[model samples]
Target: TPLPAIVPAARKATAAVIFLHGLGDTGHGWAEAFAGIRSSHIKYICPHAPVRPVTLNMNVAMPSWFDIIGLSPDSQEDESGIKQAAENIKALIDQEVKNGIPSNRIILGGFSQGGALSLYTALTTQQKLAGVTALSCWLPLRASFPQGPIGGANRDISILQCHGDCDPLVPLMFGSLTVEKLKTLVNPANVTFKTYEGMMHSSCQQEMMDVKQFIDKLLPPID
Candidate 1:
């Protein structure tokens, strides 16, 4: 079963957000952090990654969306694994659509590896989402997929990507590369990348504020 639902407090939920966690982390941590970004009209679903062997981590098992063979620019990407995980994430998006939330009223996002998966899922998914909040992530399988706005959906899907300038892991360079790639796939004006100064590969108070503002703009309370 998934973690306990982070439902709205004083209003009927009209929108849904499915957030994923980083490698080795459960859905619980980011679920709690999203408390700072919660809204009365939005229900947040932080899905847990399955336990699997991470090749980069010496094949030791942990919570991961896919196997990371390496972090280098030329490293082999687990194509099958990434696609499979994207399918599962899309299932979650589909479930929300069936639960009265329109596909456009839902969001997909995550941190680190989870964020990378969010980008992959949103691009390949048939369900058009409100936006994608990818933090500290690189686009997975960057060379394996065709240019997106895939099948003519999410043509102008707004994206909020944030990263720390000094991130040791998933360095700022990767973030810049993804931004350039994203502009080619989606509406250039709709993609916004926010960088934090002196921050590492982690979250911060101002970053959450930015996320909160992004969510509010995308999924404001309804009548």
Candidate 2:
């Protein structure tokens, strides 16, 4: 299947939202989330993570941005795999630019594994972007941080981070620490965060509404 995306009917659109999905999900998963935020100005692109076999999880195959060598969330590091995913995402951005989409008109977003990977690209990529949206995820490759912060000259990109207060999977502590690290890496003014009250790994309608407003504020004027 082709890469999934949502193209808003904006006149002279200023940017695009490239969404990434979590483990065991396809691009269509997050693409469905953007459906509620049908804007005439923001283009939403949801790229599917390539499927890989899970060595630790009963050997069953699942959708993943990269492989998890072990269950250690912190120790489950994969620089080479993440680097490859980043390059693929970069190519997609480049393709958008080639199609007349401005370099500063693209935002990257994702959930869980996808979310961590999205932040990975946001903090390490060489090119600047409109912003980043990371839902239920953390910053991977912690060692390359500070120096690996992406969009250096492309600092105009903003960031939207969402985490469920009760998400036991990723835990609240790691998520909080990621935010703290982000503050040190990028200007705090460029990041926006929201914690869902008693919510779990998924999003609620209110979260969807919040994302709509955030996208509106980030993109340029429509019409």
lDDT tens digits, residue span 76-151, model 2: 6878988999888888888888877776777788888888888888776776777787888888888775553444
lDDT of 2: 0.77
Clashes of each: 0, 4
Output the number of the TM-score-best candidate.
1
Per-model TM values vs. the true structure: 0.95, 0.90
lDDT of 1 by residue, 1-223 (tens): 5554464545588888888888898888787888776888888888788788999978999989899888898999889998999988887788778888999998889999999999988887778899999999999988866855444578689899999999998999998899889888888888999999988989998998999899889988887
Against the reference, the lDDT scores of all candidates come to 0.86, 0.77
Q: Look at candidate 2 and tell me the lDDT of residue 19.
A: 86
Worst lDDT run of 10 residues, candidate 1, spans 1-10
CA RMSD of all predictions: 1.5, 2.2
